[PDB]
């Protein structure tokens, strides 16, 4: 690997979890973990600018966006670098997930935050005033700082 | 400035606080904090390798030491990059401190941990087998993940 990181998440309600990052190759970052306490269904998952938790998830800034792109889904060419699309919580409120990203690098996101949202990310497709800005996924439920790890 | 960071400390006991970093110039990093819940007296303060809290303060690794130096005080040229010496808690258990460090950089610290110790850092001077390794300051009381904060 070329770097490992871990985000330990929590928030003002029931939502908590642990998500790990591993830069498998220079091209591919593995992001995998488990978040629970969720309502069943799709929840937006994004990396945000900052990891400042002094105002809980409010001091984390916006989706990480170094290239000045619009909001999109993880497969889209026009996406914020922090845009990881949705994860699904099952009927027990548990989201166990695994994705690889080609844009996000561990070395870029160290000390930033990983945040899960109240609702579904529309992936910029929703035709809503927020679609190309946030994905219209409602409140931030839980956040964790992306911290360096031995792995 | 050339970057900002923040760490929120907690541990198993009463120790907690907030510490902020700002890289003022290429030479100088401002570190300013308040930590409460301490026993009165001197406590070691260090940046450690990792910000991984999955085993609480035990997964943070050792003092950050990219240059393979010996442990020292913050004004020494033989020190770990992460060596910030002692902070003093007053009679009420509060340590308010402000340092300007010439070696530690804000880009060093982010994603790592800031840890405050049970006892006094001997600054490498104590003649003990741990002096040049840790400063012999006992247990870890509290640790905070050092996060990026807004630079403007
Ligand atoms: Zn976005
Ligand atoms: Zn040291």
Residue numbers in the entry:
A (entry chain A): 85 to 235
B (entry chain B): 85 to 236
From the publication, what sentences describe this entry?
Superoxide dismutase-1 (SOD1) is one of the most abundant human proteins and is an important part of our antioxidant, redox signalling and respiratory control mechanisms. SOD1 folding, zinc and copper acquisition, and disulphide bond formation can be catalysed by the copper chaperone for SOD1 (CCS), which forms a transient heterodimeric complex with SOD1 to facilitate its maturation. Here, we discover the mechanisms that govern SOD1 maturation and stabilisation through interaction with the chaperone protein hCCS. Combinations of mutants yielded crystallographic structures of full-length hCCS in two different conformers complexed with hSOD1; an hCCS domain II truncation complexed with hSOD1; an hCCS domain II homodimer structure at higher resolution than previously available (1.55 Å); and the hSOD1 disulphide knock-out mutant used to promote complexation.
